[PDB]
From a paper:
It consists of the auxiliary subunit [name] and the catalytic subunit [name]. Here we present the structural analysis of [name] in complex with [name] from the thermophilic fungus [name].
In order to test the role of the [name] N terminus (HypKN), we determined the crystal structure of full-length [name] bound to [name] ([name]-[name]ΔC) at 3.1 Å resolution. Crystals belong to the P 32 space group with two heterotrimers in the asymmetric unit. First of all, the [name] active site is empty, although crystallization was performed in the presence of CoA, and the [name] TPR-N is slightly moved compared to its position in the previous structure. While one of them locates in close proximity to the [name] substrate-binding site, the other one occupies a groove formed by [name] helices α8–10. [name] helix α1 comprises five hydrophobic residues (Ala36 to Leu40), which bind to a hydrophobic surface and might limit access to the [name] active site.
Author numbering:
A (entry chain C): 26 to 42, 57 to 70, 81 to 125
B (entry chain A): 4 to 354, 365 to 573, 638 to 743
C (entry chain B): 1 to 175
The structure:
């Protein structure tokens, strides 16, 4: 935080430290198949993924663990 | 809770904090804690002030303690988050920030801070939502529109990002003056977005109509040339590259651009040279305009031109001439011709430094040192003759040292390079080289002392400390590899980890800029940085040290205030394979095309008994180089392991293994 | 060699070039701050004929100019400053420092209306002083005693860009 030398290196820290109607309208304008718990536990251990990513991966392939694992190890 | 005398005391705790009066505020908060000792809000704020005075450790525990007392207090979680955000644990911070906002939404300061962490962890959906809310609260400021456009853009929603930008523009009653830099930058950002959707027709249209007079002149001129060429409007694109050519005669691609627009076939050698000569005549100081024609010229046409080029450079004494032409040595004819021409010039020479005859000899010296035409004995002779003519030339002796290196005599190479340093002690480049050569000869303590001639003097902890501070990755890596070669596992690991830590810093460096770039309005640069950051550790600077670490841990596995200054804890690890993962994960995720990474990943995972990840590594390595010697051995090694231990492991693993294993030839 | 506008991905190798050739070094974060505030002002010399050792090799940086404008003008008068300028020893005497400066000066005027450009120099340099004075036309403005931790005095040198401005304004209006 604002170290003395160079003055600027201190400054680098320092720099780093009504027609509404169209707008309002513009802004208002601006705005599952049950899964097996064990499959999720198998993938977490063997792919070393978080429970979230393991579940998500299974969900991407309709709970087919063998399909999901085969897909994941395919290279670009 | 606390009711009213205490109520005003809490308020003077907030006031003293916003006035940076820490002491009056602790004593003030303490008056509340004597009345309400389990008042979380007061306690966290006390936890807060300690952190603002480098008691991070106690501070965190106090905040953790405060949050347990009142888990439904929005101050405790915010504080908990603020501590986290200071301490770079962005993941618990994002989570903790999330609960404070969950207790008290609408708070503009908290939402601002939430959006930053969110873009920092590339939660695009979060960032989009965040900016939209923010835009809703303060829609008179252009920044909030651009910010939401940025959010949409990074999410992949280009159409909506363009919409947000265009919507703002339609609200402007008066056209801003061409001196307005914010507007200029906003237009080009929209323009690049039009192009990224692949609508080159429209982006060019928008360029000529709305961007014609933007202040970033190079950007406008290059986009124009790029777009015209892709649209095959060749005459006009030719003309566009000429405007650009006049600005910077030294940029290879502009000539390329021009020549394509003229419809000149690479076979027509003479027609291409005409183009280059026109600008060589027009811009006598362009090196490019003289040098580039040697790429496609051949036979006598090459010789004649190469002589004329060599004569310019040698007479001027330019030392980078060889280095500037050696790419051509893949073609044997051009290789031999250049050596013959140098020799021809030497004899033909008529009459201080290394200007002239010495300079030609140096080309030949380097010629026979280069691996495509290597003859180390003749090279030595030429360099000895150059040094004969000019004994104080740094670049000559430096090349000599490099020749010794190639003979394999590292000691002589370091001694000569170090001598080379002694001729220009004011010049750091040769100093770094000397240090480097000394490290290559495993002379560590000497090399650090060499570097010491240029590190800030009264740095505490000597040279090594300054170089670490100044993020000097080259030295750290080389020193580690040197220490490793000597069996010094402790310091080797310490160095590689330091390079790992330097990259964590670089990744965190972008934190203040998510906000900062909105003030400058310089948005394209901002998206460039995020995207560069998105591929940060693909840089060889990471890769080298990281593969070393992993390799050193692999070795360690088969042969069983600074908290660790000699890296002694590292060598004594009980889980080497575990300590390797943080290096490996980045290698595999950002550098997948490197077989070396995959082979090393495979070795780490089989040892880890994780046979599924091993195969993924194997399949990767095999896809890059089918017949690589290592992958065939490891492939054969896995199937032995699989056929043996398949009864103990679950059936789905056996099945997926066996299925995707036959693919792979071992 | 090959001259082009600074790119954020160049920053690690720019920094490395700086570490090799110059005693004044900075955190990576400090290059970012230049790159994101004034992306139009910094240029690099690139060794393009370098063979690639790997599928992910970045451009090998053999020269650079890092420039910025002072956000707080002397008299409400915008002016550029050269934060750092260097060329690898292996690539000297090709005109590079001169080229980098001319690319930068031109962008400072065009994008930011720079009235002049300035720089500081430790007192014992020569090669650079001939570059700034004899080649670029910088005049010396004053002496900074003990510019920093290191005791050497510094020269503040300045180049009037008035001449470039009329040449530019005459040609921008005429087109």
């Amino acid at each position: 935080p604002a170290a003395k030398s160079a003055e600027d290196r201190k400054a680098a820290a320092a720099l780093s430290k009504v027609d509404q109607e169209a707008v309002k309208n513009a802004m208002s304008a601006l705005s599952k198949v049950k899964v097996d718990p064990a499959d999720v536990n198998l993938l977490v251990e063997e792919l070393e993924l978080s429970k979230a990513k393991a579940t998500e991966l299974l969900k991407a392939h309709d709970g087919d663990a063998i399909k999901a694992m085969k897909a994941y190890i395919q290279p670009a | 809770p606390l009711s009213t005398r205490e109520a005003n005391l809490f308020r003077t705790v907030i006031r003293h904090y916003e006035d940076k009066q820490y002491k009056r505020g602790l004593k003030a908060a303490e008056q509340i804690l004597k009345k309400n000792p389990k008042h979380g809000d007061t306690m966290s704020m006390k936890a807060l002030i300690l952190n603002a005075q480098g008691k991070t450790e106690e501070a965190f525990a106090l905040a953790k303690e405060a949050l347990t007392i009142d888990m439904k207090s929005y101050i405790c979680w915010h504080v908990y988050g603020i501590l986290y955000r200071t301490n770079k644990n962005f993941d618990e911070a994002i989570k903790a920030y999330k609960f404070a906002l969950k207790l008290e939404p609408e708070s503009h300061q908290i939402q601002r801070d939430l959006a930053v962490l969110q873009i920092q962890m590339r939660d695009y959906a979060g960032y989009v939502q965040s900016r939209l809310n923010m835009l809703k609260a303060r829609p008179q400021i252009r920044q909030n529109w651009t910010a939401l456009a940025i959010a949409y853009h990074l999410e992949g929603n280009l159409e909506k990002a363009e919409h947000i930008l265009t919507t703002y523009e339609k609200s402007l009653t008066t056209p801003p003056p061409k001196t307005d830099l914010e507007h200029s930058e906003a237009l080009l950002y929209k323009n690049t977005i039009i192009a990224e959707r692949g609508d080159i027709e429209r982006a060019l249209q928008h360029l000529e109509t709305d961007c014609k007079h933007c202040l970033d002149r190079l950007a406008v001129m290059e986009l124009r040339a790029s777009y015209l060429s892709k649209l095959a409007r060749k005459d006009e694109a030719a003309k566009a590259y000429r405007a650009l050519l006049d600005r910077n005669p030294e940029h290879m691609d502009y000539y390329k651009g021009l020549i394509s627009a003229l419809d000149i076939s690479a076979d027509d050698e003479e027609a291409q040279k005409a183009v280059y000569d026109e600008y060589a005549a027009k811009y006598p100081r362009s090196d490019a305009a003289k040098r580039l024609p040697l790429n496609f010229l051949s036979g006598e046409r090459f010789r004649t031109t190469a002589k004329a080029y060599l004569t310019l450079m040698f007479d001027k004494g330019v030392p980078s001439t060889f280095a500037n032409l050696k790419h051509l040595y893949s073609d044997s004819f051009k290789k031999e011709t250049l050596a013959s021409l140098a020799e021809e010039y030497l004899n033909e020479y008529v009459n201080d430094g290394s200007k002239g005859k010495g300079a030609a000899l140096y080309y030949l010296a380097q010629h026979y040192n280069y691996y495509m035409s290597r003859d180390l004995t003749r090279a030595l002779e030429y360099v000895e003759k150059a040094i004969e003519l000019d004994p104080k030339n740094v670049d000559f002796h430096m090349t000599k040292a490099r020749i010794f290196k190639h003979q394999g005599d590292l000691a002589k190479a370091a001694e000569t390079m170090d001598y080379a340093r002694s001729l220009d002690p004011k010049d750091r480049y040769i100093n770094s080289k000397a240090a480097k050569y000394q490290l290559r000869n495993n002379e560590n303590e000497k090399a650090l002392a060499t570097m010491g001639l240029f590190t800030r003097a009264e740095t505490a902890g000597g040279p090594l400390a300054d170089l670490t501070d100044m993020q000097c990755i080259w030295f750290l890596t080389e020193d580690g590899e040197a220490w490793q070669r000597r069996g010094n596992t402790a310091l080797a690991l310490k160095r590689y980890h330091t390079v790992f830590s330097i990259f964590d810093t670089w990744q965190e460096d972008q934190f203040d800029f998510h906000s900062f770039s909105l003030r400058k309005g310089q948005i394209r640069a901002y998206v460039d940085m995020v995207r560069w950051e998105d591929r940060l550790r693909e840089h060889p600077f990471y890769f080298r040290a990281a593969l070393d670490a992993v390799n050193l841990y692999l070795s360690m596995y088969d042969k069983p205030k600074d908290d660790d200054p000699n890296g002694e804890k590292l060598a004594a690890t009980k889980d080497p394979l575990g300590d390797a993962m943080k290096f490996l994960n980045y290698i595999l995720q950002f550098s997948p095309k490197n077989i070396d990474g995959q082979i090393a990943g495979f070795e780490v995972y089989i040892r880890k008994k994780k046979y599924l990840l091993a195969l993924r590594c194997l399949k990767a390595a095999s896809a890059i180089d089918k017949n690589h010697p290592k992958v065939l051995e490891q492939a054969a090694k896995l199937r032995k392991i699989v056929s043996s231990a398949l009864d103990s492991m679950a059936p789905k693993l056996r099945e997926v293994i066996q299925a995707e294993l036959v693919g792979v030839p071992g | 060699m090959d001259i082009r506008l600074l790119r954020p991905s160049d920053i690690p190798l720019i920094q490395h070039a700086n570490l090799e050739n110059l005693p004044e070094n900075y955190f990576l974060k400090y290059y970012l701050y230049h790159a994101l505030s004034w992306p139009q002002l910094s240029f690099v010399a690139v060794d393009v004929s370098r063979p690639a050792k790997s599928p992910y090799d970045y451009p090998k940086i053999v020269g650079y100019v890092l420039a910025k404008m002072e956000e707080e003008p002397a008299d409400g008068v915008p002016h550029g400053h050269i934060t750092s300028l260097s060329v690898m020893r292996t690539h000297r005497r090709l005109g590079i420092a001169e080229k980098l400066m001319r690319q930068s000066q031109l962008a400072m005027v065009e994008t930011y209306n720079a009235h002049y450009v300035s720089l500081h120099v430790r007192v014992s340099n020569k090669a650079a002083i001939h570059l700034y004075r004899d080649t670029l036309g910088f005049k010396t403005e004053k002496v900074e005693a003990k510019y920093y931790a290191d005791g050497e005095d510094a020269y503040c040198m300045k180049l009037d860009l008035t001449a470039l401005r009329e040449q530019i304004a005459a040609q921008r209006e005429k087109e």
